[PDB]
Amino acid sequence: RYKPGTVALREIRRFQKSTELLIRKLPFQRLVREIAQDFKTDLRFQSSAIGALQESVEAYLVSLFEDTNLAAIHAKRVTIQKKDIKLARRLRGER
Amino acid sequence: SLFSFYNYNPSGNKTGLVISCGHEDTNVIPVVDGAGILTDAKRINWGGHQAVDYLNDLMALKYPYFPTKMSYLQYETMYKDYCY
């Protein structure tokens, strides 16, 4: 049979060199549409602004995620938790 | 307005008061001996068009999350049917 962890680093390497888009266009597009509903009504968009939004969000999530990975290994751990995320938010200074 | 007054007073020399509610304005014209005294007429800048626009604005402000867009003719039907 198999062992966990080695296939985890395997598709870490598989997604590491490839630099594709990750999250699909349509559901995040709908989410952007409903999050702009409450400020102004009957707002349209364009396809370049949605892609700019996707790029900024994936950049934010990656830049938070290896930082919270570093926060996880500094407490001698591999699995991430709530308090690792709160510590990353506190140390990066959005509070 | 004076044409309608002449229609309902065909002698052409009567004395009366005319109130006309038009599409874009409302006028009050006094008539002396069949001749309109235009130095005493008055006008209010309000008509049916402004009334339907007023109803449309009130409905837009009342329900800000209405999912369907309503046309001018629909608001005209609501103004014609249920206003008194």
Curated annotation (Swiss-Prot), chain A:
The modification N6-acetyllysine is found at K17, K25. The modification N6-malonyllysine is found at K17. Phosphorylated by IPL1 to form H3S10ph in a cell cycle-dependent manner during mitosis and meiosis. H3S10ph is also formed by SNF1, promotes subsequent H3K14ac formation by GCN5, and is required for transcriptional activation through TBP recruitment to the promoters. Dephosphorylation is performed by GLC7. Mono-, di- and trimethylated by the COMPASS complex to form H3K4me1/2/3. H3K4me activates gene expression by regulating transcription elongation and plays a role in telomere length maintenance. H3K4me enrichment correlates with transcription levels, and occurs in a 5' to 3' gradient with H3K4me3 enrichment at the 5'-end of genes, shifting to H3K4me2 and then H3K4me1. Methylated by SET2 to form H3K36me. H3K36me represses gene expression. Methylated by DOT1 to form H3K79me. H3K79me is required for association of SIR proteins with telomeric regions and for telomeric silencing. It is found in: Nucleus; Chromosome. One of its GO terms (molecular function) is cupric reductase (NADH) activity. The modification N6-propionyllysine is found at K17. The modification N6,N6-dimethyllysine is found at K40. The modification N6-methyllysine is found at K40. Core component of nucleosome. Nucleosomes wrap and compact DNA into chromatin, limiting DNA accessibility to the cellular machineries which require DNA as a template. Histones thereby play a central role in transcription regulation, DNA repair, DNA replication and chromosomal stability. DNA accessibility is regulated via a complex set of post-translational modifications of histones, also called histone code, and nucleosome remodeling. The nucleosome is a histone octamer containing two molecules each of H2A, H2B, H3 and H4 assembled in one H3-H4 heterotetramer and two H2A-H2B heterodimers. The octamer wraps approximately 147 bp of DNA. Histone H3 is a component of the UAF (upstream activation factor) complex, which consists of UAF30, RRN5, RRN9, RRN10, and histones H3 and H4. This is Histone H3. It comes from Saccharomyces cerevisiae (strain ATCC 204508 / S288c) (Baker's yeast).
Curated annotation (Swiss-Prot), chain B:
It is found in: Nucleus. It comes from the Eukaryota. Belongs to the actin family. Present with 2170 molecules/cell in log phase SD medium. Component of the chromatin-remodeling INO80 complex, at least composed of ARP4, ARP5, ARP8, RVB1, RVB2, TAF14, NHP10, IES1, IES3, IES4, IES6, ACT1, IES2, IES5 and INO80. Probably involved in transcription regulation via its interaction with the INO80 complex, a chromatin remodeling complex. This is Actin-related protein 5. The chain holds residues 169 to 252 of 755 of the full protein.
